[PDB]
Amino acid sequence: PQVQFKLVLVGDGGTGKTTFVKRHLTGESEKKYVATLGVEVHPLVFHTNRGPIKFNVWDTAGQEKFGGLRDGYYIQAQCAIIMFDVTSRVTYKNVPNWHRDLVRVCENIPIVLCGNKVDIKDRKVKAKSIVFHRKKNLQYYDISAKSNYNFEKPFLWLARKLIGDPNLEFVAMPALAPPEVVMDPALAAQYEHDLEVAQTTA
Amino acid sequence: MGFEDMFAKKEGQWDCSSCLVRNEANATRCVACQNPDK
Numbered sequence A: 001p002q003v004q005f006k007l008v009l010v011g012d013g014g015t016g017k018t019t020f021v022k023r024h025l026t027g028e029s030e031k032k033y034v035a036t037l038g039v040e041v042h043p044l045v046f047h048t049n050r051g052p053i054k055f056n057v058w059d060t061a062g063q064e065k066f067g068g069l070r071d072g073y074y075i076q077a078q079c080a081i082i083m084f085d086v087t088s089r090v091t092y093k094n095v096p097n098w099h100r101d102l103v104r105v106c107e108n109i110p111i112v113l114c115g116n117k118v119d120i121k122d123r124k125v126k127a128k129s130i131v132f133h134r135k136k137n138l139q140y141y142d143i144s145a146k147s148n149y150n151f152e153k154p155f156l157w158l159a160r161k162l163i164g165d166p167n168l169e170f171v172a173m174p175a176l177a178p179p180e181v182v183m184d185p186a187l188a189a190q191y192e193h194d195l196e197v198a199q200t201t202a
Numbered sequence B: 001m002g003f004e005d006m007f008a009k010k011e012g013q014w015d016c017s018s019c020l021v022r023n024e025a026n027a028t029r030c031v032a033c034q035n036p037d038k
């Protein structure tokens, strides 16, 4: 039995949404363009200890702002990723706008917030400054699409929430495009610790 | 273990071949992308 979920990937233009979803090579080769909506749906299979899960990831073809996506985009969304760029504070300021736009149409679906491009040393939205809330349907991760850093974590968290199994594991990583940049491991270690503390002090 | 089939297709539901959204039996085109069932 294969379960599938519609996942809406939203966020300001230029934050790396397309670069991120395209890391999953089979999802890219089997992507479907939806002409009526201007959307590419990437069917991303992940292999868990309980069988395969498919996240059908909706990625926009344009540079829409919050509230600028056609209505069909959000219809029957079962989970979401909101993405911003840690080198552009405006894209983070707009995260609450995307979040509000989501909860208006989809109500209580699990959502992951992703700060992308953490491979860039000059980080403007610092790990310690990331706003954490009491929401149990919300989670944050740093990511670097171009290095595959933390690529699987948003999907693993959503899968655990959706399936209701906090011990769900991926038994193998998906085939990903080779990294194009290096994620500095000292920064990664520091970011991860900084986030544990901000996630714990709240 | 497998997956608890509370995510499985219910009676008469169909998956849109254009956008993969799951539709109800009485829908003749996709509620999301409006492509006709084919």
Ligand SMILES: Nc1nc2c(ncn2[C@@H]2O[C@H](COP(=O)(O)OP(=O)(O)O)[C@@H](O)[C@H]2O)c(=O)[nH]1
Pocket (backbone or CB within 6 Å): A011, A012, A013, A014, A015, A016, A017, A018, A019, A020, A063, A116, A117, A118, A119, A120, A143, A144, A145, A146, A147, A181
């Ligand atoms: N250094 C770095 N650059 C990235 C990353 N992801 C995207 N970029 C670039 O950000 C620009 C916009 O990427 P794109 O995927 O088109 O963003 P979208 O508009 O949200 O779909 C492009 O020049 C990407 O190459 C990343 O993880 N690290």
Ligand SMILES: [Mg+2]
Pocket (backbone or CB within 6 Å): A017, A018, A019, A060, A061, A062
């Ligand atoms: Mg794009």
Ligand SMILES: [Zn+2]
Pocket (backbone or CB within 6 Å): B016, B017, B018, B019, B020, B021, B030, B031, B032, B033, B034, B035
């Ligand atoms: Zn459809």
